[PDB]
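ok posting inputs for the zinc ion job
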Amino acid sequence: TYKFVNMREPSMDMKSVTDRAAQTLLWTELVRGLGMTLSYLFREPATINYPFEKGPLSPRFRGEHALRRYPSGEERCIACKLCEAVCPAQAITIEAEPRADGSRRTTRYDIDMTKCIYCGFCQEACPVDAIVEGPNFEFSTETHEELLYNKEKLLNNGDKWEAEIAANIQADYLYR
Amino acid sequence: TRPTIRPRNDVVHKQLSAFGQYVAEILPKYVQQVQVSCFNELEIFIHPDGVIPVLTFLRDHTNAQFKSLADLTAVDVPTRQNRFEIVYNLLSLRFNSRIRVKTYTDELTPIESSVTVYKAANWYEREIWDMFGVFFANHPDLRRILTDYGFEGHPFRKDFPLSGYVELRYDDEVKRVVAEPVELAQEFRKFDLNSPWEAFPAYRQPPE
Amino acid sequence: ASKVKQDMPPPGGYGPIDYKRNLPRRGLS
Amino acid sequence: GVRTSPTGEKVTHTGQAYDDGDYRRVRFSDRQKEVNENFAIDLIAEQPVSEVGSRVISCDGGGGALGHPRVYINLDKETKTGTCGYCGLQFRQPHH
Amino acid sequence: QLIAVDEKLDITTLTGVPEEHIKTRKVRIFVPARNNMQSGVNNTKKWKMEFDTRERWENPLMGWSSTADPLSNLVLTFSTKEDAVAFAEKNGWSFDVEERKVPKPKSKSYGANFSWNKRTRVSTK
Amino acid sequence: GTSVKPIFSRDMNEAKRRVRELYRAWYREVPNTVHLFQLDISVKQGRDKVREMFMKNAHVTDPRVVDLLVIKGKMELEETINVWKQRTHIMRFFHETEAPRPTDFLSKFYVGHDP
Amino acid sequence: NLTLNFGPGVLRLVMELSGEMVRKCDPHIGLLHRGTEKLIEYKTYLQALPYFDRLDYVSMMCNEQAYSLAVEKLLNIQPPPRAQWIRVLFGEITRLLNHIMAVTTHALDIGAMTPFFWMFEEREKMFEFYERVSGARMHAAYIRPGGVHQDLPLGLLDDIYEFSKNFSFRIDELEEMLTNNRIWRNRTVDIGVVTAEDALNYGFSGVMLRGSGIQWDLRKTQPYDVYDQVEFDVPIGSRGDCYDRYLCRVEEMRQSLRIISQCLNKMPPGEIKVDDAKVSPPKRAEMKTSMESLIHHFKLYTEGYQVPPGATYTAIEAPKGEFGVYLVSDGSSRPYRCKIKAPGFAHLAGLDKMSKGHMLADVVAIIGTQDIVFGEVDR
Amino acid sequence: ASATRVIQLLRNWASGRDLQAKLQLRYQEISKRTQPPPKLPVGPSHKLSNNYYCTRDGRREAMPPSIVMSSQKTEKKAVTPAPPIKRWELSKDQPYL
Amino acid sequence: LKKTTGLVGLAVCETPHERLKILYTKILDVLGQIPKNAAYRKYTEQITNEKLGMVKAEPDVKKLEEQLQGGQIEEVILQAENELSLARKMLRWKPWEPLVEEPPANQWKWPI
Amino acid sequence: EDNKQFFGRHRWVIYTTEMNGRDTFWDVDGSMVPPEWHRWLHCMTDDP
Ligand code: SF4
Ligand code: SF4
Ligand SMILES: [Zn+2]
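and the output
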């Protein structure tokens, strides 16, 4: 099924021609557009008062990365390198070795935030919910160097944001 | 074939096989092979000399009328004596059908330009020349279209490295943008992902 | 015990959704 | 359990610290060195050993689907305790 | 309509490769050896062309691995050794070719596990 | 044997004639390029660079390669004449920022592992 | 007969003009050439999916859908019904987003600039829909070659219904500002007229065909997913100029509202990715309880699934025209070749013939009516 | 919307329609930001028996393309690639705009 | 008679039966010069004779449009002219002759 | 909070005049919100 968008022929009756002439000479449709703009002037604007008001977000939102840990304080990451393998931008660099207690842990976990595309593939590849994408998005920087995160920065981000991260994961994990 | 398997269409398969045999019968001077894939796509493998005739036929014959050129591109296969294969995708609106025409060339053999058959080919051919180094004869204006001015090489070739050979920066001594040999602070990490234990027995090659 | 629960349309569907062009004629010859 | 270098820098949980002759220390002048204060090895060392009356125990890290993959740990050796390969929690049979 | 020229193919001047990445490199043409950690042989079927390893150093910031040679990740696949030799020759690269290693056929007999008088008799199974 | 399809030239002489035509065109254009881009080089060294770039390919004995090179050089000349290039593209032929590389065995020994 | 170089989304235009008329107009492109097709050969199929978000970055999920359909055809599998309905619903939402952007940017370049704000409020609401379903506002990566990544949250359909039932009035305000305005008509009528045969031979598609009267639409002639289960009309032009194409785009916005209503009412229950763990990853609980699920998760996220060897050309009716992919698989987990066909490529190639014998101020209108985004043109 | 009666009448008359009926700002009619947990059913391959993977393996059912007319190895009516497309119908909902 | 075929640039043809007859007779005349054994000649002759009989057995234009399966007799005339041009060019090309040459041994072998 | 305001303007924060070490009478920014109130303020949840 199809429709014609512009296939109407104007009436030739004196009345139709006079109406078209009145439109041409008196600018009726221009006045109609002016009235539309006038009506729009008198309705409440859609502006919010940033930063005192914020934009609504979802528990699924992808923001700044963080490394998490178990309630005992032991870190969840066991250096499987699945996030490094899946990263489309090759933004994760991992080095691991046995710990002093024989535990399988990382000695290097770097994320280059200027290569990252914030796709969230790493957190869905993780088998132990170690690397996550947090809710924070206000982390602009004055230099390029501070956007190259090492393991200490990501652990500090986890310790900073764990409350919100845990609440969001509780809200959304039944869809995963 | 339960709900996870793609359903198959035998009527379209038969129709495309019949049209392939029809085309091969009509143009035996240029057609070397005809194929219909399991997802009902018909491709015709031709000799390079028949690019202009075959295409013209498929555009102008009353039983084909493939009036639309959907895409024209090239594929680089270094292991073949003729390195590059040229792929034409054609759409027929009268018969609601699609067809594919393949031919081949190497780094030094020109291919006839098809701008006289399809006006759309022009830029496509430029792109091919830009990315693979295939020259098209009788092209109205063949030149680079995607790469930077004065760029050396053809980046879509398999032996071309991913990051190229030069990188750009701003120099304050000469007060301009300059090109230098590429140096990466982090080398791209090459992954060996292919597993042993072949996946598909239906595509096994003879052990020669 | 628990039954399947996912995002679904309400029973009876949704109300009609207007899409046709509506540019009224104000009216004066 | 953070330590300090003989120079004055903090030592990370990976044991990193620039030596005295390293020029790279200059990156921290007028700035700071980011170090996480909570060492995971010390924190997991403080957990009590759980006592179970079975030869085989299962661990998933707590929280069900929010933990780690479920693994089974053998507790036949009385010399040592069974340790989870993901969580670090320890289990033992009630000796004596 | 045909030149009928008789000369070896050389497309070196057309590929845009810098001069010192042509006559200085050494390519290796070989069938890759089977990974000894596994038994599958599907990765020992095709011929590979790979370039010589160059210097890798440590990035002073972040300690990453840095390289300066653009061909460090370039690996080409070929059906036969002759195809790889032809490609390397027309591209002006000096090459070393290694012949394909094939597991020799072995005589296997389960009955030899339980031998009357030979040393092949097993002590456990 | 080994019959091949021509690009433009049936033999070496036609290819040489096309090469000479392209060289004449570049030689004529060089002063206009120097003036119009406001370059800091002289016409003499511009023409020397043109000659050097021509001599870089002087070892080719295949007419198809030769006239493909001529097609590429004509493309480059068309880019230069129409001022599609900028001053940076023109100046890239001279590598004025790249540090000199010693060809001596001892110097390459001293700097690193690269032969 | 002078020459002008209108250089720096970003486009360089070299034109010869004699007086006010345009004698020749050659676009120079490549200012956004990123080498996407070469980069894709170094990725698994899942790793390559997010590049299609960035190809035509006004219609993300449509490119996602085209790539997913190509990979599905090569894999010989099919998505579950609910995934198909979700795909078509979000494809129509994406068509609404793209058409808003195209029309309001056209008007802003002409000089109107008020409907841009009026409709970008609605665009922000649909960005909210994107974020609630995927966590990202534009580069979503939601539609996968096995279906969709996640099911919808429990209250999303209600909010989509609430939004879609007020959008027709916003379209009506747009038309009140533009449709019958004599200045807009004088800027658009009889500008960039292209005939049907020339449009066919030049490789045009979508509106650039339908404005000239060609009755063609890929969702009607070669339906994919559940499209053959929804009814809608195809707007068709009569004069093949910018004004008819603008009218067609507004009508397609209305028809997208119609299709969205149907999709909302017939959303079925069930799973959202294919129940084949060698292609689609298992659930997290299954991954954390079952041995096969853990193995398949590990292998799918490290190596990726292998695709049987073969080549396909898969095309969809994207909001800007026929968007296609020629995908060549050699049997491994990485594509051997991926050629992206973008309609804006052919449209910009035809810009030269479309602007013959027009004013300099008409080239802007022709560019706006061609609906050009250079991410897909340059790739 | 907290607009006075006079302002509502003025904006309605200038716009030419009733604006309070269809407001572009959202209010309590949107869904709550906290929702009950979902249950999320399983797919058709979740059976405990009669569920062998070889009977539901899509990738292994793909085959190399069928070769017709290899050049290396009757009335005869003419054919077309597919039957001719049928004419579209003219929208017995709104044929003209 | 109708106006505005609906495609931009496609004019309405008055008296299309005579135009169709002339075009089909020209196509048959050109096909006559092609060798009898050529598949193109016999196939196109079959198609053209079918259409010529169809237009000679129907005076009405709408019923002819329905019966010819092309619709919009103007584009049928356009297709007839395209077929005539192809017939002349194909007489020039002579593609009924055997294959020019075979491809190399593994030119079309995929994968690798 | 004010639920009679439209969505997006129904919740807001008045920042403190002095955070950890700096005067924030004039210099405020969105990163001064702690994560729990950050969750409430961005409407990721309905519960403060
Ligand atoms: S979000 Fe995506 S790009 Fe960023 S680190 Fe994770 S996987 Fe890599
Ligand atoms: S963050 Fe997760 S996926 Fe990445 S290495 Fe650690 S455990 Fe593996
Ligand atoms: Zn544990």
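notes: Residues 2 and 50 of chain H are 63 Å apart (CA to CA). Residues A 86-89, 91-92, 111, 116-122 surround iron/sulfur cluster (ligand 1) (CB under 6 Å).
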